[model samples]
Target: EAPNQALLRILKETEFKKIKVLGSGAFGTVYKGLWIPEGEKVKIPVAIKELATSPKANKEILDEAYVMASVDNPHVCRLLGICLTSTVQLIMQLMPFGCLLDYVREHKDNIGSQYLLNWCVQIAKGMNYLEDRRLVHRDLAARNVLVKTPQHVKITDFGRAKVPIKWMALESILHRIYTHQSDVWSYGVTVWELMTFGSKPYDGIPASEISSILEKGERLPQPPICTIDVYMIMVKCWMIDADSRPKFRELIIEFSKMARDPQRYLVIQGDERMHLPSPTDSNFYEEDMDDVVDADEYLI
Candidate 1:
């Protein structure tokens, strides 16, 4: 049954008008919408995500909402409201540029070293902020990162996020519970994506093999575009011992320093701004070239 107080509050306070479908995932469908309050002259754009119509689905929605509410960082998406009725839904801030996955796909050819460096720095800042607040984004991937503007990146989709209890130790390295350290591991995969434009982390591996492979400390191959320092950081993140990974605070400082002085990060052999090859290029790896329209899922 729906929570009476919550249902009443949602119906009485929310003014929703659908604009367009934003995206869909395992849990719910998101729609672009306009939200207006009783006294407001201007309407705010929002992403309205409807919960799946089932008891189990409703529980998932509520759990995700709770996690979203706990995240108050500027780089995190804000939750505006929740509906608890015959159907459930969550109202969240709208992202103008959709997902980082989309941006990388569209601009893959023109991706430059400066752009990649800036992106990595911003992502580190956001992850570092979340870690400081004791929150860990367990699923930090390109699909979960959204762009509010060209210069602003916001991390969203907190369905897998969790705040670990202070005394609990993470389980096996291959199948451990979420931790800030795990988030750092995900961040390293994200850095790999930045260097390759939008390559898949473990593209051809089967799901059953992932844990063992990860346990063995296998990582994406170093891309030609990345410097040695960046590669070193990636290696640190993918270390067999999670505790050996650099904390987000330290990562933020390292990335910031690199951004301020690119020469200190790595050496480039050719023009860093060279255009990426076309999707049809004979040597192109669909996993590395982001311009393929049907490659979105792989990019994530």
Candidate 2:
């Protein structure tokens, strides 16, 4: 019932030392760090998330730590410990390759369709674990995923600290209701990002118009390299009615079917390279670029 106390450890601040800054955000800063355990010979590398020093954010900080600590799946990021010093610090496993977005963006061309399909299965299995645990990862997107290897990605950033409107379900945007079904909708967008090699979702569309567009049943255009079979699954996740969306379990099977039979599912066309640079050449993103993070940027 309560979050697993055994895994949710209160670590000593002295045990961890920051190496370099990874990134900074509205919440706090993340850093590459060396963590020396109480009596262990080996020093572990970790991502030290330093929370802002504020009494008000305690609830969210604890909720994030608990949710992360309670889960035990290779595809899900693990929370190593919490350091309660002058400020709250969340010690987590350091992913060597950083976020999936940047990783895919940098290496999209070298990767094969089978790897993409495998990642879909990996993400689904992680989401299924959270679903079975009765937990909703309110924010599920490619950017929140971390890459350990080309074939491995782990889900992170579990708290609903802010709303990500672009990846949200219609119900979440309209009624502010989040459920496993809504998570399925967000997962669809993440899959789209994967297929597109980390392109922003709904790139040409303005944020103000996205809700109306979805209301009219318009979905993202299929990626140039993606097969119809894979796009069909993305469309399924974008079903207007939340109930119509597939559960993570169903998605696992759907992705696994393709992964097991890549010959039928992966039909790559070399000419698709021409399609990739055309949109950027036209300054597509510059026209619609909003913010690294802005509420106005996501919600209308």
TM-score top scorer: 2
Candidate 1, 1-300: lDDT as tens digits: 433232212533356677789777776688987665555444566688885377787887788887776666667775676766577888877776788877787876666555566777788888887876677777887778887655567788788777221111223333566688878777887777767767766677766666666556556788876778889998888776779988877887887778777655644544366564444577532122222221111111
Q: Which pairs of residues clash in candidate 2, taking residues 3 or more apart in a chain or in different chains?
A: none
lDDT of 2 by residue, 1-300 (tens): 655454568888887689899999888899987776666544666789887466778778888887777877878987788998787889888776799889789876666767778889999999998887787898999998897656677888878622688899998888888899999999999999988888898877778788898999899888877778888989999998889889899999999989887657766554224222222365421112331221111211
Q: For residue 275, what is the lDDT in candidate 2?
A: 29
TM-score of each: 0.78, 0.85
Q: In model 2, where do residues sit more than 4 Å from their true spots? A: 1-6, 269-300
Best by lDDT: 2
- Cα deviation in Å at residue 98, candidate 1? 1.6
Candidate 1 global Cα RMSD:
10.0
Q: Which stretches of candidate 1 lie over 4 Å from their true place?
A: 1-14, 163-173, 263-300
